[PDB]
């Protein structure tokens, strides 16, 4: 199963640089070219450039020119892309792909990395539990407030509960994000049984467990 393990650094202050990393194992690394695409939340999927791992090669977009530089590495099999003179617009999700020789398509895409240019202090997601208040199916919740940068990982029952679950995108209110997730279950299950939403946040390497308990 040829694929590309992605996800370089996600947060660096505006005015500095980073190096999103792209591992491509599942075929011969130096045989095919690699592609770097950009997707800003305004849904524009811009084509950056492309490199051929064996040679030196390259074809940059006369836009990200000087804004991006493609690094080799034949040894470990990992492509790199350093982005400098970073600002608020470089903040986006970057993709690495493989082009298939003969025709110029991107046959295998990585899972892309999310870059966040910003001078904001990382902060632990405060986790409060959402328990029904007015004394079959009941929905409960977890409110993940004030955390930077993205993202967090919200799960119910260490992964055991995955249906009736709903995790809503976050909302930046003022330098901080705040997101919540909901999970519905048959009434019998709770509070007859335990329901815990574990939230993760690598940025602050915080990993919390908050179980919903009756009457708030």
């Amino acid at each position: 199963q040829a694929q590309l393990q992605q996800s370089g650094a996600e947060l660096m202050k505006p005015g500095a640089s980073v190096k999103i990393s792209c591992k491509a194992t599942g075929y011969t690394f130096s045989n095919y070219w690699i592609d770097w695409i950009k997707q800003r939340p305004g849904h524009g999927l811009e084509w950056i450039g492309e490199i051929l791992p064996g040679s030196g090669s390259t074809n940059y977009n006369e836009k990200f020119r000087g804004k991006a530089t493609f690094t080799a590495d034949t040894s470990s099999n990992t492509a790199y892309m350093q982005l400098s003179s970073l600002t608020s617009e470089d903040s986006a999700v970057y993709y690495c792909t493989r082009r298939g020789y003969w025709a110029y398509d991107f046959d295998y895409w990585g899972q892309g990395t999310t870059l966040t240019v910003s001078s904001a202090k990382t902060t632990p997601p405060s986790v409060y539990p959402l328990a029904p208040g007015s004394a079959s199916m009941v929905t409960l919740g977890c409110l993940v407030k004030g955390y930077f940068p993205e993202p967090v990982t919200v799960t119910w029952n260490s992964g055991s509960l995955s249906s009736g679950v709903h995790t809503f995108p976050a909302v930046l209110q003022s330098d901080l994000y705040t997101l919540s997730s909901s999970v519905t279950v048959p009434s019998s299950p709770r509070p007859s049984e335990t329901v815990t939403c574990n939230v993760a946040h690598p940025a602050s390497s915080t990993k919390v467990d908050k179980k919903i308990v009756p009457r708030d």
């Binding site: 592609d35 695409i37 997707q39 849904h43 524009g44 999927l45 811009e46 084509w47 450039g49 492309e50 074809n59 940059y60 977009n61 006369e62 836009k63 999700v93 993709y95 082009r99 298939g100 025709a103 110029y104 398509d105 991107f106 046959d107 295998y108 895409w109 899972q111 892309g112 405060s126 409060y128 539990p129 959402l130 328990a131 029904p132 208040g133 007015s134 199916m137 929905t139 919740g141 409110l143 407030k145 709903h166 809503f168 995108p169 976050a170 909302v171 209110q173 705040t178 997101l179 919540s180 909901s182 519905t184 009457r215 708030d216």
Partner: protein, 214 residues
């Protein structure tokens, strides 16, 4: 540079239906037009390469025609898993360009949201903050409304919302809303109301709670 254009940016369709997404190019492309699929969560996988027609090991209900400037991808039988955004991309000249996209939706029966409001947690109150969460889940169509009435009054301040992409196992949507205030103002009132207005009920589905009741 070559401007790739996709006519409709969004498309709704019922299951079983055939669907044809069209992508146009700034000029002949010698048939160098590919097609991709990006379901939510960013996952993307190709669909067709060279001027449509050609697959990669993907489903057989996907196909595409195209000559010089006008190509187009086609979904024959719509399955409740085809909901995603589809792009096109010419790999003929440089630099390589993509179309604008085309979010595909699966029309399904009009349903009502299941509402649920929640009072501040014991934990956040200790910190001087009062956030009230209300959930409006599994509704269709996506256009719904939410208003907060504190002690029979207005919202507008302290409310942040968040809609979800259409679910892939029941073509439904869900919305979350959050009324925030200083613990101090939370204690200045007794009734807190989440008023949701959709078009499946000629009367807003309502949930709310008071403070001494708890």
């Amino acid at each position: 540079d070559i401007q790739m254009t996709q006519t409709t940016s969004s498309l709704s369709a019922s299951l079983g239906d055939r669907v044809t997404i069209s992508c146009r190019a700034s000029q002949d492309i010698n048939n160098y037009l590919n097609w991709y699929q990006q379901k939510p969560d960013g996952t993307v996988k190709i669909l067709i390469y060279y001027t449509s027609n050609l697959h990669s090991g993907v489903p057989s209900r996907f196909s595409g025609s195209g000559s010089g400037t006008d190509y187009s991808l086609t979904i024959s039988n719509l399955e409740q898993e085809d909901i995603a955004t589809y792009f096109c991309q010419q790999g003929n000249t440089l630099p390589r360009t993509f179309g604008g996209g085309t979010k595909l939706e699966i029309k399904r029966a009009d349903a009502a949201p299941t509402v649920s409001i929640f009072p501040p947690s014991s934990e956040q109150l200790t910190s001087g903050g009062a956030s009230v969460v209300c959930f409006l889940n599994n509704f269709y169509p996506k256009d719904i409304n939410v208003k907060w009435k504190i002690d029979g009054s207005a919202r507008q301040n302290g409310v942040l919302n968040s809609w979800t992409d259409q679910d892939s196992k029941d073509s439904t949507y869900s919305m979350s809303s959050t009324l925030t205030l200083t613990k101090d103002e939370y204690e200045r009132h007794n009734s807190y109301t989440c008023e949701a207005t959709h078009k499946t009920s000629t009367s807003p589905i309502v949930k709310s709670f008071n403070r001494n009741e708890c």
